[PDB]
Amino acid sequence: MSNISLIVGLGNPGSEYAQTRHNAGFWFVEQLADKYGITLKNDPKFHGISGRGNIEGHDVRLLLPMTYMNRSGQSVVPFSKFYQIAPEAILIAHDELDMNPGVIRLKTGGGHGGHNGLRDIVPHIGPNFHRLRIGIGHPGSKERVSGHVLGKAPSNEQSLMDGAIDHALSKVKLLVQGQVPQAMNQINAYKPA
Amino acid sequence: MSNISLIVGLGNPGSEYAQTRHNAGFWFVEQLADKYGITLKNDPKFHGISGRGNIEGHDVRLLLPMTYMNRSGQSVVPFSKFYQIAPEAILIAHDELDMNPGVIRLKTGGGHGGHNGLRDIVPHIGPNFHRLRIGIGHPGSKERVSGHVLGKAPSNEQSLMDGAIDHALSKVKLLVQGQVPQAMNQINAYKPA
Numbered sequence A, B: 001m002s003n004i005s006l007i008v009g010l011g012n013p014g015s016e017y018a019q020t021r022h023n024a025g026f027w028f029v030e031q032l033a034d035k036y037g038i039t040l041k042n043d044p045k046f047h048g049i050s051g052r053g054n055i056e057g058h059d060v061r062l063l064l065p066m067t068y069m070n071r072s073g074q075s076v077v078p079f080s081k082f083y084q085i086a087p088e089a090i091l092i093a094h095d096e097l098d099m100n101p102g103v104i105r106l107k108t109g110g111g112h113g114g115h116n117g118l119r120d121i122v123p124h125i126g127p128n129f130h131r132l133r134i135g136i137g138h139p140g141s142k143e144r145v146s147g148h149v150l151g152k153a154p155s156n157e158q159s160l161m162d163g164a165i166d167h168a169l170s171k172v173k174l175l176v177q178g179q180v181p182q183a184m185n186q187i188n189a190y191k192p193a
Helices: A021-035 A073-082 A142-149 A155-169 A172-176 A180-188 B021-035 B073-082 B142-149 B155-169 B172-176 B180-188
Strands: A006-009 A041-043 A048-055 A058-065 A090-096 A104-108 A130-135 B006-009 B041-043 B048-055 B058-065 B090-096 B104-108 B130-135
Touching: A006 A021, A006 A073, A021 A058, A021 A090, A021 A130, A021 A142, A021 A155, A048 A073, A048 A172, A058 A073, A073 A090, A104 A155, A104 A180, A130 A155, A172 A180, B006 B021, B006 B073, B021 B058, B021 B090, B021 B130, B021 B142, B021 B155, B048 B073, B048 B172, B058 B073, B073 B090, B104 B155, B104 B180, B130 B155, B172 B180
Parallel strands: A006 A058, A006 A090, A090 A130, B006 B058, B006 B090, B090 B130
Antiparallel strands: A041 A048, A048 A058, A104 A130, B041 B048, B048 B058, B104 B130
């Protein structure tokens, strides 16, 4: 069962958010979908955009909530309930303030760490899902966070994040084939420098 | 109807947006509510925060959509329909890229001007409501707009906007008493001291 069967990317809808750091999770899942030719389409029943298809021999669903970040549970929770996907089979990709651009880690369990998208999900399905933490850097103060995550990264930082995302994409085969410890080892070993 | 009986402030929910330029309409309506001791309360039926009370001898409703900016019609339209408030009795306060900080104008009719909150309202109630256009400046290109409206203004620009808002607050008496041409003349003449 330990096979990942639902991959969620967190972010905000609309072109004015598409390039902002808070959409790192969208970048990962959008790139994953086209890598495998999985069409993402409007899914208003679950307040999101979703897709389904073959990833490395496994039937995997992809979900981008269209709720705005802090209401992501309004999509993730009914979607996972309807398709009866347990938290242990869910991977949620999200921006991580507490890692620098180019750093990327697979985490199982734990809390939200102040991430307001995760904050809307953990209360309802519990903590025991997997997370792809995509480092975006921390601006250095609580008051600067909103302008950081709702801002577009400069090209040098974007290059670092893109390389980390590319590396994680290369390890999705391990995740969907039920080899999570191996995926965690190989993702977390990524060095951007 | 001729008096303004509903005053809407546009913006985004949450502390991470509260100080951004795109929330200029919230600033005006929040300040108006407390000026007259009108309590703004959660109104989930209408996907907003709302209140009602006496402003200068008239019973006036106040509304902040909690939909996020580009979905503001999901609050404004059913709220105004439920209370049978005609567009001619509605004032919508919003940020205006086409005016500078410290410039503020009352406008009747017309379109959305690219404002994606107004874009979600005009289709459903039509254009014939009044607007309090709170200048926030234009950054000089389309690509810079998102980071501008979703950013916090520097202190000197904030002071200019706050002074314009203070001035418009002092003219709400004319609006709720139906003296819209006089309100327009007196609001639009504002210049920073």
